[PDB]
Design a protein around this ligand. Structure first.
Ligand SMILES: Cc1cc(CC(=O)N2C[C@H](O)C[C@H]2C(=O)NCc2ccc(-c3cnco3)cc2)on1
Lengths: 99, 142, 86
């Protein structure tokens, strides 16, 4: 299965899809291509929980019913290497008016 | 744009693969859309019709356009060579705009749609309901 | 491969070109980045979602599901929709 993520960090959101079977670490590579930062310099989360590079998306709980192209799940991203990791932080989205 | 008056009965079946209440529509020997009873989403039904007759499907509440076997228009085929003909009814990928009229159509009485601050040109697009008689006049060109 | 689309509230949305070139508007502002002075982020996110929901589901049997639009967002979405031609 393809799983559809929204890789979020600061004021930054990458939309990507990935196989269920693929790995945290593979996702970390995909980030390399885009924001040009090597997997060492990045940690990756869902919902606070901190993810392990060897575990499949499927198993981190990304499924074809978790993350539907139309409502893709979020993955937290945080930087700065062994030399101190910045805390998890994600600016929220602009608020909707009246009705 | 009519059904050809064969009298070769053809057994069809309408599977509704859509969140919506679908209204099947047989297009007459003269041209006029006749409507059948509708299908609660999920829901199937066995149907007797005839080779070369023409159908088309839509939301029974907001006449929106659905597909049947991936095209706009259903013609029942050779009733045997196995037996029933399979009519699968789907949302297209509406464009984001039409979809966007939908939610708004469904959210506001079109009496009270002039008090909804957006460009006049979008007031016109929104008061512009999909119509079968229209779409027929549309489809009728190709 | 990728292109950025910048909200009017700072936020940046990396999406694939292929998903991007769905907006005939955006096909022309690319051809790289695109600022949008008058589309907040709470919109551009749904848009991007639509491009992925559009690119996934067109040309397919696999019962297409409903793209869900939250009421609060309808008008603003409608207006981006029309501008972005999609
Ligand atoms: C000859 C001749 C007669 C007719 C009129 C007719 O009997 N028709 C027209 C369409 O083929 C439909 C077909 C008909 O009346 N079928 C009986 C029928 C009754 C209910 C349904 C039904 C129920 N829910 C959805 O459709 C479908 C077919 O067409 N050719």
């Amino acid at each position: 299965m393809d799983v559809f993520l929204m890789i979020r960090r600061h004021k930054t959101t990458i939309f990507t899809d990935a196989k269920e079977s693929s790995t945290v670490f593979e996702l970390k590579r995909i980030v390399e291509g885009i924001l040009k930062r090597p997997p060492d310099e990045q940690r990756l989360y869902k919902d606070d929980q901190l993810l392990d590079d060897g575990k499949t998306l499927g198993e981190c709980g990304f499924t074809s019913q978790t993350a539907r192209p139309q409502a893709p799940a979020t993955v937290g991203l945080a930087f700065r290497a062994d030399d101190t990791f910045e805390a998890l932080c994600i600016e929220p989205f602009s608020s909707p008016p009246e009705l | 744009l009519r059904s050809v008056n064969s009298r070769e009965p053809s057994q069809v079946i309408f599977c509704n693969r859509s969140p919506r209440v679908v209204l099947p529509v047989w297009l007459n020997f003269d041209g006029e859309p006749q409507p059948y009873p509708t299908l609660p989403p999920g829901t199937g039904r066995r149907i007797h019709s005839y080779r070369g007759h023409l159908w088309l499907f839509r939301d029974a509440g907001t006449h929106d356009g659905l597909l049947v076997n991936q095209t706009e228009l259903f013609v029942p085929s050779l009733n045997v060579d196995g037996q029933p003909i399979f009519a699968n009814i789907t949302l297209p990928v509406y464009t984001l705009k039409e979809r966007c009229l939908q939610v708004v159509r469904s959210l506001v009485k079109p009496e009270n749609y002039r008090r909804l601050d957006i460009v006049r040109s979008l007031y016109e697009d929104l008061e512009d309901h999909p119509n079968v008689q229209k779409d027929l006049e549309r489809l009728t060109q190709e | 491969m990728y292109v950025k689309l910048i909200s009017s509230d700072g936020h940046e949305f990396i999406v694939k070109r292929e998903h991007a070139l769905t907006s005939g508007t955006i096909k022309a502002m690319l051809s790289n980045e695109v600022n949008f002075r008058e589309i907040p982020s709470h919109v551009l996110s749904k848009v991007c979602m639509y491009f992925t929901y559009k690119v996934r589901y067109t040309n397919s049997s696999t019962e297409i599901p409903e793209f869900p639009i939250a009421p609060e967002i309808a008008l603003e979405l409608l207006m981006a929709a029309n501008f972005l031609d999609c």
